[PDB]
Subunit: 122 residues, 4 copies
């Protein structure tokens, strides 16, 4: 699904996920969040299953953004874990974990959890 | 925390996380899981906050492993999201999401969640 | 939101959530899952914020089902954590954790995570 | 495990979980959090598997606290999902989801995720 995954994707929040899937299982690109302490593009890297099952199952993948770029630093990182589902209306369905750097006293509230669905349109 | 993070880490399960932190915020290395449908090393990539807060807060980071290598393919990917906490007994405290490729009918049970703590010894 | 929450709700999977919100913050009712190792209704109990903010924010709530009834026992429990959002198309948006009873060796894979959205129609 | 679960438990944060397990699978009691926007005791309710497997597996359970009592209202609810593990050093190992009531604009950051381990001492 190298060609299926490679390109520009948009989630329900209007964030933009620009990704290249490599033959070797690599994901590289940029992420622009429509929400939160973020502006412009941030580097992302990740991995995907480059030899998925042929039984109609989705293709497992994940990637990370650390929320530091030349404009801002939100001292946090989000990882999206999900699967790519091919077809006429292709989707990447994910769950994510956003961890902020905290003191030990505040570590219990370090991590947000959510879910993003990415499509090729929007 | 380039030097602080770079090296070999072990979690509570006895898994081995070998990572290089780049000056640019990159994480690269390999992961060997002591449990599950895995053998030998798997490629990982991720990101960390290369300019963390100086108020005693941890350093946010995350990384991904897709569970395909030359030995096995478990048609799944795990993302760890966490923070590095420096000091005499340095730790990387994480939460993770493991997504398996599934049919649409089974998508509701696609994702496991857990928590791993990594230390420099063990 | 006692009256707002009380009633029959359906999620994206076609599961049926029948709930009574008490004046005291209690949730009681039954859950019928359209998927998984389940049949018929299971007891649920939970809590909601009975004096929510008046700034347009949702109403926080949660509930638990242990997957044992007179028909089956799936040796597991799901907790839904979310908020009720009132209005013409009322919704309860949730994230959930499903823990299975496991041996210590398998504890790392004990917990599934997902997200369900409940509406008054469907 | 009615007798095994019933009693007073403490987590790693120093929070106090006082619970009665009913013959029917009910959990009732109070929770006092050592951290966050909380003081004194809050009502909890939940469910557990009252007929667990006899193969050495843990006992699945979950419970909810809405963070409103006579002292404070943090417009949020936490659900703990986990398993009870009996023996000389009994434990309840959990993962939790804390949802705050939010506006629709802030719904993406409504939910914290964490993990608490409860023991009979501490």
């Amino acid at each position: 699904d190298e060609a299926g995954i490679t390109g520009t994707w948009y989630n329900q929040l209007g964030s933009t996920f620009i990704v290249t899937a490599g033959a070797d299982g690599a994901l590289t690109g940029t992420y622009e969040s429509a929400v939160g302490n973020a502006e412009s593009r941030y580097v992302l890297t990740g991995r995907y299953d480059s030899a998925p099952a042929t039984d109609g199952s989705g293709t497992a993948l994940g990637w990370t953004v650390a929320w530091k770029n030349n404009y801002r630093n939100a001292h946090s990182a989000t990882t999206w874990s999900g699967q790519y589902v091919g077809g006429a209306e292709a989707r990447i369905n994910t769950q994510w974990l956003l961890t902020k750097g905290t003191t030990e006293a505040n570590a219990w509230k370090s991590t947000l959890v959510g879910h993003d669905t990415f499509t090729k349109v929007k």
